[PDB]
Amino acid sequence: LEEAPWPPPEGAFVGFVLSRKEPMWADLLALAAARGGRVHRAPEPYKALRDLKEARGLLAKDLSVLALREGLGLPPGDDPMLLAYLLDPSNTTPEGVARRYGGEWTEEAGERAALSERLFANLWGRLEGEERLLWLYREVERPLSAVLAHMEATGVRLDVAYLRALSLEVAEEIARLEAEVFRLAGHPFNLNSRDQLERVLFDELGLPAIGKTEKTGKRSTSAAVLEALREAHPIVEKILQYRELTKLKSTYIDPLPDLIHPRTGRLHTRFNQTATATGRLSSSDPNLQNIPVRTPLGQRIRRAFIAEEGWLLVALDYSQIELRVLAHLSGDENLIRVFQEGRDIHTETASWMFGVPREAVDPLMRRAAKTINFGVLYGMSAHRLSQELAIPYEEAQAFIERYFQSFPKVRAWIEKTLEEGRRRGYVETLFGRRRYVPDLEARVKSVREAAERMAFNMPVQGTAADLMKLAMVKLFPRLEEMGARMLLQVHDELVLEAPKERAEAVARLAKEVMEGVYPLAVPLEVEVGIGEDWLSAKE
DNA sequence: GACCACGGCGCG
């Protein structure tokens, strides 16, 4: 490409190099643009940012986030990563997409700009005739990248002093647990080392091994194994408690306070748009889609996520979302009827689990039923179900039989999905998002059946993802108009931040936008709460 | 300092 002076003409593709992968923390080291067989290299990257009308190119969102950080309203536009990811969601990295579709991902901005241009041309041609993928790109993914950029640049407020205080308390409890474990073992060891623990449990204390690890065949010390050994030796419960506390401390309590951005005073995640096989987003650096909530200490951690003073958090979560999606995809009359009648399958399974009438099912019971319902749907064994519930194998087998007998078109939908997947090589969501699953044709049963479970999960999980993404795209401009902010997405949940006086109106509007995103054979229902912290906003 | 595979586990 012929070198031409900065600035480039409009519509040019950008290339940029960051000192580190996270745009909220990166120094913009270089910036370039490419168009019309010219490459324009910026003498001074930061000032040159002010010349662009939009970020168009590989990882466009990341440059947009950095621009927003610097107070520039630079929206992301076309991005070849999004085209590639829609063609095949195994296309997750610029390194791989470049190799597959026409170049090499290097560490120079000019080359990245020229690459973005070249890859866009080739990938755009590959989507020709692919109207459903094209619709996903234009109506969902491309606009969503703009929304995600704003979310990343906005961040979420964290009560740092609270977490610092919590760390000191948890450390003291961890010490009590570890000391008791060493007392019971007869000697100290590194309790964080599963290899050392294996030797203590199975060689020294002579507890029965229960399961093996996947890749190396060691005797497993997983929580499931420890659960089954809970009554074999007093050390086991102590280990389980130690595991819970150290997991929460090392992953959330300690690292999060150190990630507050100096300028914004907030915590900023990255919403990765081309990272999953199903069409879900992911979140990283830090992952804010896995903040604890299911246990008491976990709930204490979630309380650290708070609204700006004078504002409130609004949390909205789709009800029974993958079951509703399954009703639509499978067309099962019974499943459809459940939702037309306003019933709750989580509550119903909890009723059976705890042997109480539906009226007596408390929120804790209902929530315990969730992993059971989705586990069973997506192929969990009777052995596992019986172990997890401490019921006879025969009763677990019966539950699984009844579950599918209750919704007889579900198995029919699964079989149709797998047959079509074997023939075409891919399965698809309601909107036509694809996932290639070649191992449906594997000659090894273990491999093939694992591939089958992946394959029939994808249309359900992926359709739910498509719906949430479309809802985000519809909702964002409404929030801007009301002076509210979109902060986080957690798969079927959004967390927003609204001025106190407007929080009620924002809640109502967001609920309606999400429920009406795309009418199905069953209604979509959204649960919405408002509060000063993330825990209180989900009730 | 950094990379990795692994086991393990937090969320959806």
Added chain:
DNA sequence: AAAGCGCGCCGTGGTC
């Protein structure tokens, strides 16, 4: 662990 699926991050053990 076990026929649930989808993620990212932690510490260990082992390099490099």
